[PDB]
Symmetry: D2
Subunit: 187 residues, 4 copies
């Protein structure tokens, strides 16, 4: 089964989580794992002014999402929604929608946040879009700051540092668990 | 694989939908289907005053939910949430939660509504509880009044009549599709 | 303006928060503040065996919600929804809905959780119902620090952590935010209604 | 009171609804009403090829949102969320968030959909962001029939159906509800701010 970890990061928190998700997924024998990012939509000079961390993962196209049995989506919490970049990207998947291309495939969501709240709403509002595509939605439940909706990191914004070891463990779990389901369903 | 259709109905709309869901599930060779209701919490005299339709399906206990590979939950739209009866029932599943008993099992949701709106919020707010239990959430997507979140019936409240043939077809689809996934995952 | 703080509590956490909300509301001259609870639905023997806490607040009826200008709703988080007791109570507001009785009145929500997870969904899923009644929804955002009586969460409404075992009590930081919510909502109620 | 109707539209459906909202708002004496759009993010050539509609409204900046008492946000439904254009615009409100600039101001939301599905989630997921800014959320409920200029949906905000092919235009029933929303929000804005 093929697993895509697909993410948006501006300051590297989701980037770090994505690597952990992918490590977890790669523990599953039957699973082929790939990590890609959605495009940055901000002009590089605006990204740099804002202090962004340049992302180097390969860039996904909207249409290649069809190639995978499971897609694990990472986004920062942006006032309780996914980022504009992820939203712009998903707004480009209309052509898949029309064809059923993601129907029945597994979807799961991870996030990162400051200490203001909103991470639950980010994850569940991202589910909604995934449901329009007919994707099967995988929460993490009581595996575990924490939500049962998906892994999170609390990045205590500004002088910000880094995901905790416990946070990265839960992120690894989410990838291992999603990948295991993907192999059960698809070989 | 074992499939439970679990529902709450006061005026029979969800009752009618549940039968359709179960017909759909029963089309799947590997699937064993059972229909049960959550208890009515209103005193019978209060139910009758309100014009309720007496429900006769067997009553589920909260703990027997553990026996099934997939659970398809039906609730009327009540101001954009599940009914108090379904909420009281799910509030009794704490003992399962604690043990992981529903973790990884499939969950899906259907609803009924008047013409006021709220059906989307009823379905997605019910998902949230299912996620706390670690259940895998199955939307219906573009199979289809309609929502991709789950089957609905628009019961145009008062002088109310009945689910449409197209509505009942989508409800059958939801059971067939959920049951098919349950057999893929569990035999 | 008349402000109702309407709550459900099994183990006292929301009760403590309700009292805080009401204290904040009472700071507003011209706000008349009342605290009531929704009925317990569990048999008393079961409530007692479970260690539920007895409470002095008067029990609300659904009808009387019409008599206020603002209603601040408190509920524990039950798997990311309001409690079955609050849901069952709100399901008895159909007659009010049909007459418009709560339309345009102010509404706000507070919660409690064991370990954090779900609190945002509890608050926003309760907003849904408030919107069907046409109530004006008041989130708390991140208010100016000087408006809190303790020097310092969610923007959706005040919350408290009860711990995994239920033994934690609300901190003065948490209670300060609850007091702020009541004062802020009551302030708006008087601005709109005298 | 100053009321901003701030919208995104690709094919004109939300533009038509915005104009309706503004017409309703303008009925309130003392309400100063302004309509602006968020910037298009697609390259113009791609917008044109896709059949996007050109529009006269002035383009808003994020900063100027601070200058209003009420903001009524319009967005098409994009898989049950606001559009990437509105999301990208709101993600540029961090400086306003940090200064409190929108706190306590009134907010309300309207939408459009192709075939119905998702509209409720678009509106309530936009409320989330408004709450992070501490805005007072105004749903429309089911208002008294006599307040609509056409004799007669969701309670969360006005909506319109564009059809599967995008060719449907908003009905006078739908537009009446949009006009109501603007008049009702503007009325509240003047009650609160003069
Ligand atoms: C536009 C904007 C909105 C934000 N909204 C929230 C929020 O609602 N709650 C929160 O706690 N943090 C919020 N933050 C902080 C980010 O979620 C946080 O810094 C996250 O760790 C960044 O992930 P990244 O490094 O992958 O970009 C927001 C940041 C931005 C830029
Ligand atoms: C307390 C209450 C709340 C209601 N809320 C809504 C609503 O938000 N939107 C709606 O369109 N209908 C609403 N209705 C109507 C019911 O969803 C509808 O009648 C449904 O078909 C009943 O299903 P049942 O026959 O299975 O009870 C509500 C009804 C009740 C009693
Ligand atoms: C059925 C049930 C479900 C619960 N779900 C959650 C949950 O989703 N998240 C959580 O952190 N705590 C949860 N709790 C813990 C409660 O939120 C906690 O008991 C409550 O906040 C206490 O408030 P009270 O003392 O006013 O009853 C749950 C408790 C029960 C009984
Ligand atoms: C990426 C995308 C996703 C969409 N998702 C939905 C949907 O979830 N539900 C729906 O009914 N229509 C959906 N539509 C149709 C739009 O909501 C419709 O084009 C929009 O309401 C038109 O408003 P406008 O003319 O102002 O752009 C979608 C359109 C696009 C381009």
């Amino acid at each position: 089964a093929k697993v895509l970890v697909l993410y948006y990061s501006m300051y590297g928190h989701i980037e770090t989580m994505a690597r952990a998700v992918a490590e977890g997924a790669s523990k599953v024998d039957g699973a082929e794992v790939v990590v890609k990012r959605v495009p940055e939509t901000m002009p590089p000079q605006l990204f740099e002014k804002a202090g962004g961390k340049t992302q180097t993962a390969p860039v996904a196209t909207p249409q290649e999402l069809a190639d995978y049995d499971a897609i694990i989506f990472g986004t920062p919490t942006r006032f309780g929604n996914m980022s504009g970049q992820m939203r712009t990207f998903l707004d480009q998947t209309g052509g898949l929608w029309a064809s059923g291309a993601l129907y029945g495939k597994l979807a799961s969501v991870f996030s990162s946040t400051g200490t203001g709240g909103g991470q639950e709403q980010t994850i569940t509002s991202t589910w909604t879009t995934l449901a329009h595509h007919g994707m099967v939605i995988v929460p993490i439940g009581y595996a575990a700051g924490g939500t049962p909706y998906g892994a999170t990191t609390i990045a205590g914004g500004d002088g910000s540092r880094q995901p905790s070891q416990e946070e990265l463990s839960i992120a690894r779990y989410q990838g291992e668990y999603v990948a295991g389901l993907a192999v059960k369903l698809n070989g």
